[PDB]
Every structure is written in C-alpha cells, then in structure tokens.
Symmetry: C4
C-alpha cells in the first residue's frame, strides 16, 4: 500500500513545499517588524500540510546506501528518526501557544529545501539564479532589521530625515515608503554604491552599517568568483585552441620551413581542427573497453562490409577482428602519397573519396567509391614498387591494412581464408 518515492504526486508536493517555504520566509519577518482575516488560517494550514508532508514521507519510500527502494514504512520511520525528521517535525510543531523571532522553524524549512538543492541543480545558470535569490533574501532580512532599529531609536534617526525629504514632516510617511527606503538603503551598502540620501546618524545604526558593509564585501566577492569560474570554464576550450596553434607556429618559425611546406602545414592544421577540435578520436576509442571498442569500430564498417563479396560469408568473430584491424585514413584533398621503389608491406584499400594513380603520366584507377587496389598476396610477397606514384584529387580517405596483421588475423580461420582468396576482387591491382 506504500507509495514509491519517485511518484509524480511527491514531486508536485515538493514544488508546493518550495512555494510555501518561500512564502513563509518572505512574509513572517515583514509582518514581524512592520506589522481577523484568513491569514492566520493560512499560517496554521501551512503547519498542517507540513504534518501531512511528514506523514507522506513516512508513507513513501526512501533511498538507502544499500537498498535504493525498500518497503515496510517502519524502516523509513526508523531511518528518519534522529535526523532530518526531527528538523521537519520542529517545522511541523505549531508555535501559537507577539514575539516573532521564535518562528525559527522557517529557517529549518530553508535548510531542508537546501537539502533538496542538489536535485534542483541541472546546469550553471540555475546556480546563478539561486545566488540571486539568496541575495534578495539577505537584503530583505537586513531591511527588516534596519526598520526595527529605526523604530527603536525614535522615542535624529534616519526616520526623521525620511519624514523631511519626502514631504510628510513629523504625521509620518506611509508604510510603503517606510519599507522601500529600507530596501534601498540595504542595497546602498550591499553592492557598495553608497548614496547620500539616507545614511546612519546615531551610534547603533553605525554599528549595523559596519556589519552590512562586511557582509556585502563577502557575498559580492563570492558572486565575482562564481562568474569568473564559469567564464574561464569556456575560455578553457578557447585557450586549448590557442595553445595548439601557438605550438604549431613555434615549430614553423623555428625551422624556417619555406612558404609552400609551411602553408600546407597550417592549412592542414585548420583542416584537422575543423572536425577533431583538438581532441583525437584515437585516445577516446582506446578508452572504451574491448567489446564496446570493437562494436563502435564495427559501425565504421558500412563501407567494405556489404560491397566485398567474400566478406558476407565470414563469421561474426572474423567480422569484429578484421574490422578492428582496419585503419580508415583521413587525408585532405590534394595530397601525394607512397611512391614507387618503397616497401609494399603497407597494403592499401579504397575507402572514401576519389584519387588517381599517375605513374609517369599514366593515370589509372579513377575509382574511389568503396573500391580496391593493391598487390597480390599469395605469390608476390615482395616489397618494392607496385605500379608507381599516386596523384592528388578530392577527399583522400584511404584504407590502411597491414601485410602482417591481415595474415595473422586471417590464418587462424582457414574456411573464410579460402572463401576470401577465392573471391579476390581488386578493382585495379597496381602492377
């Protein structure tokens, strides 16, 4: 019969609790210093539905360190005892039995909503909103204290001055002005502007003004600190880019690096940063553990999977392995690559874009949409030149495999080995 903690009714009740705690923390001091009808009825019903709230909290489940969800509300009751339930019960104790400073349950209400603050937090802007709200609350409380001192002093205080400036000599100013100027002065000394209209005269309010000045210093410092933290948290990525560019620049100017090579170097730098944004995908790929690593590497194989006929007959373990074994090589359009007379151990398949192969003005293999070039592997097995030089074109996203890696991964399973060698499709074997 017990309700669960994440029930939406509980959340709506929590929002109503927040509204009511704000209401009481705002109206109790303002009525306590400055100040029949159903307002007392509302005040008592506040305590009543907070008693209802503790009843619900015993009814609804809680989250323990061991058990996130547990039944048997008696356990919830014994967990709440000697803790926040004592606070919320003091908040649920009527104190009607004037003397308004005994309404300290309202501050316990704010303590328990501060217990709910972490749930309320989603991003950094909400933090700024909460800081502004507590700024306003501190201001209102200090204004109530200031008005209380002003009343006590009058039997030369700021009240007589106020009677003089806004013309109501003493009569007396209305309760509207008698609070607006209080709040005005509380900000006048909290954000450190300090106007000359209202200013302390006798001793007590000078002591109070010292206290307000110190509080303002502290909290204004806190606001600066948080705002600076956020702004730096974004200019951190900004500075990452700037330091990357600076290191590149330092290398370039250190070794002279005449105009052609340099310009290719920097243009490649912005080309890289355009998509990698400084962070390499290789490191984060290695961070993900084995099986997930293969799976995310398997997603990149929507290119050679379906277009290679032998690949279809392969077993899924072979798919995963031979998939992780590939290297999809990015290169910006307009690159020259492996020459003739080099090693042939760097086996190459075609993955994306299009490239042309110029061996002494002999352009061949103008393909590039999931095609294949390279060397035979059974008999040749000889490093050297395949056909000759390659020539630059549009997107040079090629497909690196190794001549030792492919063999070691392939020879463990001879059935797909044979099925692979039988359907040896090469769009243009450069010989």
């Amino acid at each position: 019969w017990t309700i669960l903690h994440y029930s939406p009714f509980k959340a709506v009740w929590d929002w109503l609790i927040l509204l009511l705690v704000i209401y009481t923390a705002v109206f109790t001091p303002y009525s306590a210093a400055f100040l029949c009808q159903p307002l007392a009825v509302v005040d008592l019903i506040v305590d009543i539905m907070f008693i209802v709230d503790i009843l619900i909290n015993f009814r609804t489940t809680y989250v323990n360190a061991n058990e996130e969800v547990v039944s048997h509300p008696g356990r919830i009751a014994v967990h709440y005892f000697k803790g926040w339930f004592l606070i919320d019960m003091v908040a649920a104790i009527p104190f009607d039995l004037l003397i308004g400073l005994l309404k300290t349950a309202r501050l316990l209400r704010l303590v328990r909503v501060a217990r709910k603050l972490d749930r309320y937090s989603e991003y950094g802007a909400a933090v700024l909103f909460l800081l502004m709200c507590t700024f306003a609350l501190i201001a209102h409380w200090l204004a109530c204290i200031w008005y209380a001192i002003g009343n006590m002093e009058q039997p030369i205080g700021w009240l007589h001055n106020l009677g003089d400036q806004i013309g109501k000599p003493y009569g007396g100013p209305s309760i509207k002005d008698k609070y607006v100027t209080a709040l005005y002065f509380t900000f006048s000394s909290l954000t450190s502007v300090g106007f000359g209209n209202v200013s302390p005269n006798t001793n007590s309010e000078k002591i109070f003004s010292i206290c307000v000045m110190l509080i303002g210093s502290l909290m204004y410092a806190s606001i600066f600190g948080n705002v600076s933290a956020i702004i730096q948290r974004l200019y951190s990525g900004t500075a990452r880019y700037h330091t990357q560019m600076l290191r590149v620049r330092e290398f370039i100017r250190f070794h002279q690096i005449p105009n052609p090579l340099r310009q290719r170097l920097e243009e490649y730098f912005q080309h890289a940063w355009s998509y990698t944004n400084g962070i390499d995908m290789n490191a984060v790929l290695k961070g993900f553990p084995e099986c997930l690593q293969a799976d995310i590497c398997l997603h990149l194989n929507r290119s050679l999977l379906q277009h290679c006929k032998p690949f279809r007959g392969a077993t899924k373990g072979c798919l995963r392995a031979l998939a992780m074994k590939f290297k999809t090589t990015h290169a910006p359009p307009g690159d020259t690559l492996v020459h003739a007379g080099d090693l042939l151990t760097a086996l190459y398949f075609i993955s994306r874009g299009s490239i042309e192969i110029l061996r002494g003005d002999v352009v061949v293999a103008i393909l590039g949409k999931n095609d294949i070039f390279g060397e035979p592997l059974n008999l040749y097995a000889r490093p050297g030149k395949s056909n000759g030089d390659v020539r630059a074109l549009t997107y040079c996203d090629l497909h690196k495999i190794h001549r030792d890696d492919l063999l070691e991964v392939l020879d463990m399973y001879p059935e797909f080995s044979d099925h692979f060698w039988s359907s040896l499709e090469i769009t243009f074997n450069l010989r």
Copy 2:
C-alpha cells in the same frame, strides 16, 4: 631535566601568548590615541610572562635541520641567539623607563605569531578567518590614526561636524561616538562605499584619505583573489567532469553512431563516472611501488583465495605473484562478450555477479558467486570456440587471466603446479 617541545603545556602557553598578543595589539593604540588601577600591573606582567616564555624556550627543545630533537639547552640557546630570540627579547624588554609609539615590541609580537601561522593553518577556511582578522586590525589602526589627526586639527575639521550631526554642539561627543564614527569612516573608505555623513575637509585628512583609498584597493583585490582561487579549486573537478563528457559527446556526434550504440556508450559513461569519477584506478595502482602494489593487489583476493582448494596449499610468493597476475574485469549489467570461433587464449574465471551462457538457446552455468568456467589447459591448448556465446545478466564482474601469463608464472614452481593441476576444479567447463 629539559622539557620537550611537543609538550601540551607548551601548546597551552602558545595559545595564551596568542591571546595576550591580540590583547596588547588591540589595547595599546586605542589607549595611546583616545586615552591607578591594576591595568599597568597587567601590562608589566605581560612582559614578565614573555620573559618566562623565553626562559621556557631555552628550557624546551627545538627542531634543527639535522636533529629534530636535541638535548643540552645550551645548544638551543646558541641557536636562538642572533635571530628570533633577539626579537622576542626586545619584546621582553620593558619600556617603562607618555609617548606610546615606542611600543614597537607589540608589532614584533605579531611578527613572531606570524612565524607560528603555518602551524595554525589546517585548511582554507582558517586562511579566510586570518584575512578577516588582519582586515579588522588594519581598520582599527587606521581609525586610531584618523582620531589622532582629528584631535590635532582642532585648536572646520570632521570633529566639529560630528558635534553638529549627533546633537552635542561644541561640550562635545562622548568617547563612545568619537570612536564609533572613526571606525565607521575607516570602513567607509576601505570597502569603497563612501557615505556622505563624514568626509574630509582640510588638507591633512584629504592626504590621509588618499592613502586609505589606496590601501583599500590593494587589500580588497587580495581578498577577491583568494576567494576566486578557492572557488576555482572546486570548479576544477567540476570542469574535469564537463570536459570528459564533452570529449565523449564530440566523438559520438562525429561518427553518427545510431541510437542503440550511442545510448549504450553514454550510459556506460555515467556508469563509469559514478565510481571512477574520471580518475582511473589503474594509474594510481601502478604508482605504488612493487611490494605495496602486490599487497594492495593481494587485498582484492578475498574472492578466489579461500574458495579455490588448490590455492590454500600455495606458497605466499606464489600467492602474491598469481594475485598480481589477475585482472578483475568490471562490466555493467547487460553486456554481451566473447563469441565462439574466436581465440581461446583469453582464459576467464568467475569473480562477481552472475552471467548466463547461451550457445544457440542453451543456457548453462548460471553460477557467478566465486565460480569457475573456461577450458582445460593440459591437452587442449587450442584456440577456437569453447562452447559458444555468452548472454547478458546482472553484474558482469568477470575474472581475466592469460594463457601465457598463468603458465609462465606457474611453471617456475612445480610443487604448487602439481597441486594446482590435481585439484582442477571448474564449475562448468564450457566445451
């Protein structure tokens, strides 16, 4: 007969010294500018127990660079000579012989308590408390100077104004107001609020006001700096989390990564951060040197140690080695793992949670509480399929060993080799 330095009586004496230095640094200027009875007796007894203090310091031990504790108080005396003992002796010299500016020993008292400041420091909040205290002290001294200038000017100064606002025209205001307004004004120009009630009129106090404004600028900047440093020191961990998530997000959106695979990737990300909190435990494990490394790796072996019968007969060196050789593999509930037709060199034991093994809808080995599966090792020694696919369940905390590592670590000691192969317990050998 000598006392040692860390005696509690010495610490209590140090606290009393702190109380007395605060007392003197507060009351000497206030009596010097604004101002029979035992107060002179108290002032002289101050010097007396500071002489007692230097006597104790010669009696009690000190900490040298070479010897932390040394006897023979003569060595302590020769070490103190020409140094802080000269300062504390000047502080222990009576200057009774008005002229109150000669009481410069009080500032040396503050210098020597600043020597004790590092001991007083425990965390960052104490730093803020000390900054607030020195703020108050600077304020009090500047207020005393301000009152002195005010007295000198009166033969138009702020004193006559003060006589005019709080009604005591000249008579004259009481010594209570004649100091409260001084402190009020000193804050008025130190936290940069600048009220209009009291303000410099003649030339001398305008020069003084310039000096106060500059001092306030400097120290207010210092307070902002420290508070910002602390707040950034916490949002550092915040930003670490945010940049980790950002790199993950960038990888995800770079390579498309359709909804199923992506959602598993991020959910695994929060699962990891839930307990690792960004920092990998592997790095800190490798940081700890060899023997401690094995010992802390030995603590993780409360799982396979007592439940493996052959393990009990093993020698402790074998325990340490074979313990460091394991890899306790974390995996969140709901993971698929090594298939059939793969390599068998990845030997696997059961460490925590529970998992099920589905080879073509054939679920076997539903164990998982410190159990064992895998392949025989003596005769088989062949990569391939063991039984087939595994199926996802609750906590997938498995137990990686290697087929080359275990052999190389085990074959160095044939007695436990034989005892191990004899008691070859496997809860379900997947064949």
Copy 3:
C-alpha cells in the same frame, strides 16, 4: 544571374546595415523620450533599404550544411522562410500606420547583427570593444527610462533639484543638461561610484535605482571575468616557464649536485628554453602524419643532401626514408661526448658547427661544416673505441645515425647500396 554570398558589395552592404542599426538604436529612444525636416524621410528610407536587403539576401547565395554554395534563389527563399527572414521582415515592416515603444523592430535589428557577431570577431580586443559598446547602449537606454520617470513625476523629484543646483529655478534647464545629468546618474549607479549630486527621492525612482544597481553588479562582474580570463591566458605561458624551472630546481637541490654540475645543468636549461620555449619539437613532429612528417623532415636535409656525392644518385624514396632516419643532435658549445672503449654502434656524422677530437692530446678533424667522421662498416662491424675522446668547441650540432637502422633501411635497395659504398667519403675516419 544570381549574386554569390562572398561578393564585396554584400560586405559593404553589411557594413552599411551595421551603421544604420546603430543609428536607429541610438536615435529612436532619445527621440522617443526627450523629443517637418527630412528626418522622417531618412527613417522611412531605412525600412526601404532593409527591404532592399532582404531582396538581396534572396538574390545572393547562402551556406547550407550540405551545400556551401547553391544556385536557384527559390531554395534560398524557402530556407529563409520561418526563421531569420521573419525577423528581418518584421524589421522591414513600416509601423507608421506617437507611441514609440512599438519600434521593437530595432531590437530585432540588433539581434540579427548579433547573428553576424561571430564573423565580426577576429581576436580578443574586439570582444572588449563590443562589451564596451553594449555597456554604452545599456547606459543610454537606462538614461532614457530615467528621464521618462522624471517627466512623469513632475505634475520633489530629481528634476526640481536639477533646477536648483545648476541655476535655472522652476523656466527650466535646457534639454542639454536634462540629458547629460541623466547619463551621469546612470553611470553613477552602474559602475558603483554613487555621487551625491543627484539621488532618488520619491518611491518610483528608488525602485528603479534598485534595478539599476542589480544590473550594474551583473555586468561589472562580467567585465571582470573576461579581463581576468585574458590576463590569465597569457600568464599561462608565464607559469609554464616557471613550473619547468621549479621542477629543475627541485631536482637540483634534492640531490645536492655540487657547483660545476649544477651550473652546467641550469645553463643548459636556459639554453634549451631560449629556443624550444618549453615545447619539444619531437612531439609536434610525431603529430604530423607520415607523408607530411617525412616532407618536413626532408626540409632539414639541406646539409647532407648536396654535399654527399653518393646521395645524389639515390632514389627519392630512399631520400625520404634515409632522411627521416637521421637525428640532428643539438648540443650547446662546450660539451664532452662519447669516450673510447664504449660501443661503436652509435654512428656519428658531422652536421653543424665544429668540434675537436682529442685522444691523448692528439687533436684531429678540425672540420665541421657538413663533414663526416666515424668508422668503416663493411669489415669492421666491431664495438669498442674508434680513436678516442672528443674535445669541446663552438656549436656541437652533430648528426646521429644508427648502425642497425642505416643497414636495415639501406639493404632493401642494393643499387644505391652499391653506389653508396663505392663513394664512401669520410672526412676523417677516427681509427
């Protein structure tokens, strides 16, 4: 017939749009609160050439996610629909049909120029300029609001005071002063100075003053944050240097390191930082991918390329490989190096500067401008002493090759192998 987006005429039009939006956002409120002729003609022509602007935007090309440049202006039109074109069309709708608050199209103009803000940004100083500009705009708007409240209150407000201080009792002050003091007061509460000349008296302007104080707090915090971010972004490189120096110092006085060794260590440290500036060139060299890596490593080979006769006959692949295989070794003047009786596998060529070779006061090989020393390789192949010790001189930039690396890279191609061994030029083979 369509114009392209990057046409200079479009950029000049954008600059004119910026000028006109500034003009309107400045003059519309000032005329709306404080305030025949062609000014209405100018105001309407503003809307007219903004209609012209949307016509051009449909005519000129745009940049899509897939296509950077696309023809067929109908596509541009359908892309603009339901988006920024609605905003710019509301800005292009005349509202002549007093009531000046309906001119909300001017704020949409500022929104769309904020869309162009990223293009306007080049560095950080422009950011500070834009922040100052928006500061001025906020000030002007708040001054207009303040003047409006002042007019409303007059049927004790600040207007009567203004009539009293600058002598024009009521008559009334000219519209020049009636605005200069407004702006004066708006800064008086925005940068938190708070003069006493003009200050709120009745209730409405006290509420307004509270609002201004809060806005000033926020934006002043923002300015501090940005400036601190930039200054820290430079002292970051400063602190990098300092932390390198500190680590060096830590190592120095941990291990004593008497004066000769210490001094050579720090002098080498400053020598290194003089040109490497902390960042190693090795890391950035490895960062650049293969082909570019070789090409930039090939640029360093303007030293041994043209002066080695066998090198000329070599094939370009051999050039690239044997070029990447070298290590140009930096060493400051005044270094001692490999002794006799050591290994000879560290083959050494001469790259820059000059050095002396002293084997028992026998100085030989006073060369160093692209010269060669070392050992024979065909028959000798023996570790040991070559001739003996070296002697320090000016720039010790030597040329490391390996005795296994050179062979493995050279033996793959026997034609240049033979051509190399035939022209075996060694300026002084130390035997």
Copy 4:
C-alpha cells in the same frame, strides 16, 4: 675607440635618464596648468644631456639579430635611423622657439623607457610596482585636466564650492589646496569610492566625470586581473597537492582497504610528498640528454664507487655505463621485501641505511653502510630462494641491479669483467 653596450657607465646613464623622464613627466603638466630661477636652465640641460645620450648611443654598441656585438658605429647609426632614434631625436629637439601641450617629447620619453621595461623586470613584484606608478601618473594627469576645467569655468563650478567649505570665500584658496582637492577628487572617481564633498555641477565636468569613471573601471579591472593571476599561480602548486591527495583518497575508499594497509598507504604518501613534492625525479632524469644524464647519474655514485675494490680498476666508460645501470631504491623505514621461493633475477646490493634479514628468526647481515649481499652469479644462475625473508628496520634505501642488465653491460669488456670476478666482495651472500 667605441664603447661597448654593457658598460656600467651606460647603465648609470640609463638610471639617470629614468630619473629625468620621471621628473619631466611629473613637473611639465603641473607647471602647465597650475603655474627667473635656474629651472629653465635645468629644463634645457635636460634636452642637452639627452642629445648627449643619443651621441653615446651612436658611440656605444647595439645588439643585432645576427651579431650581438658589432663595431663600426656607422652601422649603429644606420640601424637607429628610421626608428627609435627618430623618437629620441624628437625628444632631443628643443621646443623653446606659453602653450605647454606641445611638450609631447616627454610622452616619447615614457615610450622609450617602456622600451626598457623588459630589462627592468625581474619578478612579479616589480610588475605590481610599475602598475602602481602608472596609476599615480594617470591620477596626476587627470587632476591637472580637472584643475584646467575648473579654471576655465570660473569667469558655480567646484571652485566656488571649494572656496566655501575650507573657509576662504571668494580671496581664494591657496595653490596647495587647489591641487590637493583635485587629486582627492581624481581618486574619488578612480577607485570608485565617490565622496560627497566635491562633485561636478556644470555640463563640462559631468562629461569629464563620465570619462574618469570609465577609465577607472578599466584599470581597476586590470589590477584585479593581475593580482588574481599571481595568487592563482601559487595556489596552483597548492591544488596540485590537493588533487594528488584526492586521487589517493578515492582509491583508498573505493576498494575498502582495511585500516592497517590503508594507514600504511597514506603514511607512505606523505613520506613521498615530503621530499618529491609530487615532482617525480625520473621524468627530469630522462629529460636531460644522454651525456649530461650519465654525468648527473654519476654524481649519485659516491657510495659504491670508492668502497668496491674492483670498481677502481674499471675504465671510465664502464663507470658511466654501470653507473647509469643502477637503481637507488628508496623505501621508508619499516618495510618488508622479497621473500624466499621467488625469483633471484632481482639482484640486490646495499646502498643506504640498515636492514636485517630474518629467515625463520635467523637475523644475519646487520650491515647497511655501503655493503653487499645477494647471490653468486658464475655457477648458480638459478632462480629461487637465496636465504629467506628480510626484516624491517631503519632507512630501507637499497640498491637494485638486474641479472641480465649487469651481464650485458659487463661482458662487452672482459678485462674489467675478470678484474670484477676476481675481487668478488660480498659482505653477506644470503645462501
């Protein structure tokens, strides 16, 4: 006959130039706004010795990009032409031919001393001093401008008020007050305090006040930024320590790690941080290149060098190699180490402190001051137990060598091989 640039006379001349530029930049405006005798003689002699200065600069050497020191002052002259020499010559042109704003050469003097600012910089405190100095200069200039406006307005400005407050009604205040209040007001609006004694009344000084407020905002922000940068630059090391401790703590509480082992872990952590301070010495050891690396590693060999008799006959290359081959192992007092039944390939010598060897309550080898234990190497060559367990004592700074490393480094030179095996001193070979 030419003087060199680093001559001390040149430095003394530079200091005199600094004094004179400060003098002129201070007195020229104060004479120009507020204000026979040799002061004109001094003013002209200023230009005279600045002409002398440019004469010296042509005489003395300069530093070029290629040549740090070069003779032939004609080259210095042609280098100075069309550059800073034009500025210094304009500064060396007399403008006597009132109008005091034409003395713009004084600002060029400040520009050229700003060229010398980098030389003046040694640390961060000098930066703060220079910022304070330029703060004072900006204040003085703004005060001169303010006084000029005040004079112009008088034919209700602040001058009449000043005549009223300090009693000198108009007569008029002395030139002392007529400047002290100017500086007072310039700070009143620059550090954002804003007193009420002096305040703008007519339009001109309100515009000026707006400008001053903006300048104060900017420069006050700059001061905050720099101070925060320095304070963060120290709390950076603070935060390094804190994050190290945090990672250690997270590992500790993640894996439970019961009290004995945990306590050993943190006590070792503090012991490490006591001397390494987070900075690992291995990294900086590997950072220093080869020869210097061996030399600084050779300094650690004042322990086994002189006490090993065979070591003396060794060749210096063997010294260097066998020295770099060692590992001086730090361990805090109270550690247990390699047991029996383990591998013997970890050869161990005694380096520092003292340790005891307990094999079944059989304590042997109580040495430790540059002594030797271990196993024979010629015939034994068998992993296993040497004698048995070791027992904890004071400083466990032991001496790691390897059984493969020592052989491979030793067998390249058989003469010291034989001399080593002949004088095979082992203080206690644990058998």
